[PDB]
Amino acid sequence: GAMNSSNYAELFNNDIKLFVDDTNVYRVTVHKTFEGNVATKAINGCIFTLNPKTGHLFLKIIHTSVWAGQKRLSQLAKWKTAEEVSALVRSLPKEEQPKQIIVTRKAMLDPLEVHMLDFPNIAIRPTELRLPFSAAMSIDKLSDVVMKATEPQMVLFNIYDDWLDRISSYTAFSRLTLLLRALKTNEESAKMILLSDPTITIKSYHLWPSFTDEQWITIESQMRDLILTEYGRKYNV
Amino acid sequence: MNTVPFTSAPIEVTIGIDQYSFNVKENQPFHGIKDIPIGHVHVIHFQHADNSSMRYGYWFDCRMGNFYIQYDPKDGLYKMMEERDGAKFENIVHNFKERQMMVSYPKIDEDDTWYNLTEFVQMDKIRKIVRKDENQFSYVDSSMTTVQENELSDPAHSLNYTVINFKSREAIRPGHEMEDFLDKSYYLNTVMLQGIFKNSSNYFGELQFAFLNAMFFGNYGSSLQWHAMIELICSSATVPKHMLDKLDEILYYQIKTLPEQYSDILLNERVWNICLYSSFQKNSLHNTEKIMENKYPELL
Numbered sequence: 001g002a003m004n005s006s007n008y009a010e011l012f013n014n015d016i017k018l019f020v021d022d023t024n025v026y027r028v029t030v031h032k033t034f035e036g037n038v039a040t041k042a043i044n045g046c047i048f049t050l051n052p053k054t055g056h057l058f059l060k061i062i063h064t065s066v067w068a069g070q071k072r073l074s075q076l077a078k079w080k081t082a083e084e085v086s087a088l089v090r091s092l093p094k095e096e097q098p099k100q101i102i103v104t105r106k107a108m109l110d111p112l113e114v115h116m117l118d119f120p121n122i123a124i125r126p127t128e129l130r131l132p133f134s135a136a137m138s139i140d141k142l143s144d145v146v147m148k149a150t151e152p153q154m155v156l157f158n159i160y161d162d163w164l165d166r167i168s169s170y171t172a173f174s175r176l177t178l179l180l181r182a183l184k185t186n187e188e189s190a191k192m193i194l195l196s197d198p199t200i201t202i203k204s205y206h207l208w209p210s211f212t213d214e215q216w217i218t219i220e221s222q223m224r225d226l227i228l229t230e231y232g233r234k235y236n237v
Numbered sequence: 238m239n240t241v242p243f244t245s246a247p248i249e250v251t252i253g254i255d256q257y258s259f260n261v262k263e264n265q266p267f268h269g270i271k272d273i274p275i276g277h278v279h280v281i282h283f284q285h286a287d288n289s290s291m292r293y294g295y296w297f298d299c300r301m302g303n304f305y306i307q308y309d310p311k312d313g314l315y316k317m318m319e320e321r322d323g324a325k326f327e328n329i330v331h332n333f334k335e336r337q338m339m340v341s342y343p344k345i346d347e348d349d350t351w352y353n354l355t356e357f358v359q360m361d362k363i364r365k366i367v368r369k370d371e372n373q374f375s376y377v378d379s380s381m382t383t384v385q386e387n388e389l390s391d392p393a394h395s396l397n398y399t400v401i402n403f404k405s406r407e408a409i410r411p412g413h414e415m416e417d418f419l420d421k422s423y424y425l426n427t428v429m430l431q432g433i434f435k436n437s438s439n440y441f442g443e444l445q446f447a448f449l450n451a452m453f454f455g456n457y458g459s460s461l462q463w464h465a466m467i468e469l470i471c472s473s474a475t476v477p478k479h480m481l482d483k484l485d486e487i488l489y490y491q492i493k494t495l496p497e498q499y500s501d502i503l504l505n506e507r508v509w510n511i512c513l514y515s516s517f518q519k520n521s522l523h524n525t526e527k528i529m530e531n532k533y534p535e536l537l
């Protein structure tokens with residue numbers, strides 16, 4: 001059934017699973033035409049498919065050419081996401097294929113279900129959690145690879161960097177969702193927080209800075225402060 | 238005109254014949270139903286006075302044999318049986334009519350309702366849905382489950398309706414996952430019509446029989462099958478024009494005949510609102526949409 005606070009630690013057991021988020025698949029800018037009408041221009045996009053246990057991120061870049069000549073792009077986006085998750089599973093060895101796929105939005109259930117009808121032993125699940133994966137495009141290196149792509153392309157990342165060397169996957173997912181929640185509520189502050197100290201760098205093969213354990217606790221606290229605050233600045237409290 | 242005699246009426250029972258019904262009291266001198274129109278299937282059905290649980294009944298065609306009802310006190314129901322001795326049968330029926338111990342099938346001359354609800358229903362196809370080859374009539378009751386329900390337990394007592402599943406291999410072509418799910422024309426026209434039913438008349442026959450079993454027995458899996466066969470047509474962008482026209486007449490007479498008080502449980506809000514207002518065929522069912530809006534505007 002649905003994934004919620006009550007069955008949260010299931011994400012970190014030894015059953016392979018993937019989150020699929022489609023928020024950033026179909027992305028547009030809205031602008032005025034010379035005639036004063038409004039028009040959209042699509043920009044590149046991405047499917048965010050994440051193993052929460054390992055940190056393995058399969059970032060499927062969605063190049064604007066996939067929309068050319070198509071109608072009803074919001075609906076098509078969901079089916080395209082489903083088509084791409086489906087070939088990802090088909091290309092992976094049987095022992096790596098997920099036993100569950102959890103979608104962050106319920107409108108992905110029916111698309112993913114038809115695409116995987118010949119995979120009856122993979123459970124497709126929704127969730128009641130309001131996970132902040134849309135903020136994935138606020139991670140500079142992921143935004144960069146999406147925007148520079150000139151053709152469809154799959155890029156593999158570990159979104160936990162090397163954290164699993166020192167913390168458990170439960171703690172690594174909690175850190176990740178805190179960072180993404182922060183970047184989603186106030187991207188500028190969040191980024192200032194992460195990059196304030198010039199001496200802490202991001203390794204070429206990482207996405208985030210090389211914080212010590214002590215520094216991560218400071219950072220995490222600073223991100224909590226931000227989230228409560230903006231929640232004040234928002235509801236005035 | 239044909240006749241279904243009854244040996245007797247030992248227990249108090251509400252008897253249905255087609256869309257008509259009448260009450261018979263315990264040991265009342267009742268010996269059956271006469272003047273039944275030849276040329277149509279019929280259903281004779283029962284609801285005991287003590288146990289409104291289990292409505293049950295028999296589908297039959299009078300052209301296929303001489304049939305009668307006899308109460309069985311061991312199994313506790315009114316049982317349909319065939320009489321093979323035609324002289325014994327005619328002699329029995331003639332005596333009961335002479336003594337005027339039979340109720341007359343009460344058809345109004347103007348009234349095409351039964352014809353319209355059973356236009357495409359054939360006894361041969363009923364017997365393939367309700368498998369009991371040794372009898373020429375078919376027993377159905379409220380509790381019988383469908384083959385597809387049994388996939389989600391006794392196969393002998395099942396309703397072998399044609400399985401329709403919108404998120405399936407027959408339904409969906411490899412590489413046409415979005416096309417075939419949003420526009421079910423290929424599932425309707427090639428798989429079901431051309432492949433399984435052969436023609437729209439057999440399709441409409443099963444769709445009418447499912448309705449009738451949902452209405453007369455409150456059979457839940459038959460209701461599921463009726464709404465599914467409607468939904469498959471409404472969800473198909475490409476449907477022969479003659480089929481849309483006939484479907485509108487079919488549904489119109491079903492909606493007209495439904496008891497107003499049973500609409501809450503026999504009509505699926507989602508399917509009906511989708512078919513009449515969202516689907517490809519939202520503008521092709523004028524008679525059905527008109528009677529639904531005037532009779533059941535709450536559901537919509």
Ligand SMILES: NCc1ccnc(N2CCOCC2)c1
Binds near residue numbers: 118
């Ligand atoms: N993409 C799911 C899907 C949809 C339709 N047919 C599929 N088959 C039929 C061919 O052999 C097995 C795979 C698979």
